[PDB]
Symmetry: D3
Subunit: 159 residues, 6 copies
């Protein structure tokens, strides 16, 4: 499991309408660029169709791993996990390990921390999706785990 291609999607109404700069997307790009090859980045509103268009473009572009940031919370606009999780053929224990680490950093606020990861399979092909919260700091923490484990996950995901 020597290298991989990866895409990045940031989900926010404000980011999408250019009213906030996205720092989370670029942090994932920079951090994963040490381990593999960036091939896709897009910002999309908090919208199930736009999120899924972006997930499948990233996959079309070759991404073996895709990380989304944003839309994981409990508001009415938040649809990231509801849109993506039903496509999984295997679900990983990411959210759980993400929460144990984030406890150190936010304690009982992890009750509101939502984050997941899964494998979408084709006949041969495998994609790992990680969905992180929108904050820069949430993402920074997520990345430590992704960097550490992404190779291990790919090796096993590929039979």
């Amino acid at each position: 499991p020597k290298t991989f291609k990866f895409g990045v999607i940031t989900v926010s109404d404000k980011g999408a309408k250019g009213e906030r700069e996205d720092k989370s997307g670029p942090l994932i790009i920079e951090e994963l660029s040490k381990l593999g090859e960036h091939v896709y980045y897009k910002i999309v509103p908090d919208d199930k169709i736009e999120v899924l268009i972006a997930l499948f473009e990233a996959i079309k572009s070759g991404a073996d791993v895709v990380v989304t940031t944003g839309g994981t919370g409990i508001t009415r606009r938040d649809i990231t996990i509801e849109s993506i999780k039903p496509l999984f053929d295997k679900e990983l224990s990411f959210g759980e390990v993400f929460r144990a680490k984030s406890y150190e950093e936010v304690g009982y606020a992890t009750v509101l921390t939502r984050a997941t990861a899964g494998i979408i399979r084709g006949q041969e092909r495998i994609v790992v999706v990680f969905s992180l919260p929108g904050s820069v700091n949430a993402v920074k923490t997520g990345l430590e785990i992704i960097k550490s484990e992404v190779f291990h996950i790919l090796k096993h995901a590929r039979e």
Copy 2:
């Protein structure tokens, strides 16, 4: 008054070029009478490939996407398992489709699988119909689709 639409035909052989797609063109022909054609692609019987196409169509503007093939009970058949989980509302299309077929093929409809549903964004709606591969099965679906598509779109958008 109109909609834009896309068509995906799912089959391994079809995609390897080693069989002709009669079913797709038939859908394209028929629905062009009722609305505008904006996408077509043939994909293997593969989840990632099916979804890439589905969302390409939707990105091209399709309000309605019809897929054909991959709805069976063989290990390869992944079309419905792949798309159903995305529905925010599911229509009773498969049931109606099966009643209409039970008049051509009877008890074989035990094996007939079809479905339709709505995928929603903040405002936008998309109706997806997934039909079997046979030209006959598609013919039956088209009658139902062309009869009800505008109705579905009306109620979905409200």
Copy 3:
């Protein structure tokens, strides 16, 4: 299975705000009053909480059978079936028989016909819920089936 108590709930934003008269609710009351005892009627907006408050009040009031009318369609406001169906411990084939009959009356429009029925169980107690579409005519058709079958359903539902 000699008699039963029954409640009726009508789900519509307009009905709730007094901008349309409800004729469906009263038609269920009149028609089921030939077979059992009316004990609850309320009109509620197309709102998951208000619908569920009304379902459980009707059940508190003694209803063994409750029929709702409205909110079964495919619009963004329509939440009746999504709110109620997850509570079922047994699901009946009502929607299917409802659709076969409604074919005669609307043909291929039954693709948009949605209607269900189920049993909510307590330790001993049993409630049958029927959820019909909002139109008077849809309901009129539903009632033929409910009148015909409600006793049969109760007899079996009660072990």
Copy 4:
């Protein structure tokens, strides 16, 4: 393409499993299906999830490709047949709808209570088809019409 299949029958009945009501439905199924495949398994079990599952997998271990359960499909607290089996299916069939359509002719609106299902359980290569029918002899005969008509179509598409 399949030449002939093996089958199992399981009647699920508290009264039957005890010795109190005579099982008329299992034997009918065995008679009818014995005309088409080799009967390899029969058992009367109480309306009990673990017993029903123990039976299903014994039928399967004995080489059954098709298994038909009768009983335990209704709406009482007793009835666990569909709830026990259905979550094992890798593919579900439209058997109940077809069953209900034929049945409607002989019982009309009573079909609102009719429950019956069929689906495929798969191994890495192996396939098993399970039909679950109601308990009455009449319900069983209508189901048998359908199985007799489609068992080979089903097995053939099920194995690819």
Copy 5:
């Protein structure tokens, strides 16, 4: 800044009067420091009874409802099976609760079940927390509830 809240304690014995409810009062006491108390009832370990109470509380105005009891693995225990299906968003409360318990009881947390979620209407939100019956288990839940309730309400209402 505040919310209204309700408390339901689920137990057969509790409801038959033949055991005292220590856990409920404890919840009422604690949450009265943070917000207004509008409902309390003791119900048997019965789906219909639990839901009647839940929606009575909500009808009384509760923005937050805490239930205690019925979350176990016995045949009677129906509290979570009864309420979870109503959630439009589920919180990671049970997980956090279990980490905090794994420090008192260790490996016994294999048996600990708790949950929380949001039920939404057109505009209105309601947060429901479902905790075990033991006074100890409730104590642990209260620490988490009182620490995060306002946060949850903030994000839920947005």
Copy 6:
């Protein structure tokens, strides 16, 4: 309240079921649990849904109250253990979380791949507890610590 229980062990391994890798994990489970309950069943089965299910219900028919599977819990296409069993549980336990918490000390972030589960299958009166563990000997020892600590608590609440 339960005095002692019966148990079964199922190791799921394509290589093992063939005769190619020696099964070190099943025997460990049998040794450890034999200190607490009566061993009534053991079988090595391929990573195959139908074989795994046939085994589970044979363990159960032999009177097992507790059954522990090792293997087939990962993220390859091969791995079907959790997918085959979990949908049968009437009540699911928080065993995976606890498993993952203990495991985190010896493998940290690798626990993102750790999958393990436990739940209860019920009959009308009877209860069966199923634990599904990963295949490695180390993963199995961490699971055994937990089962040894809780098997009786679990059985006791499971039967009421």
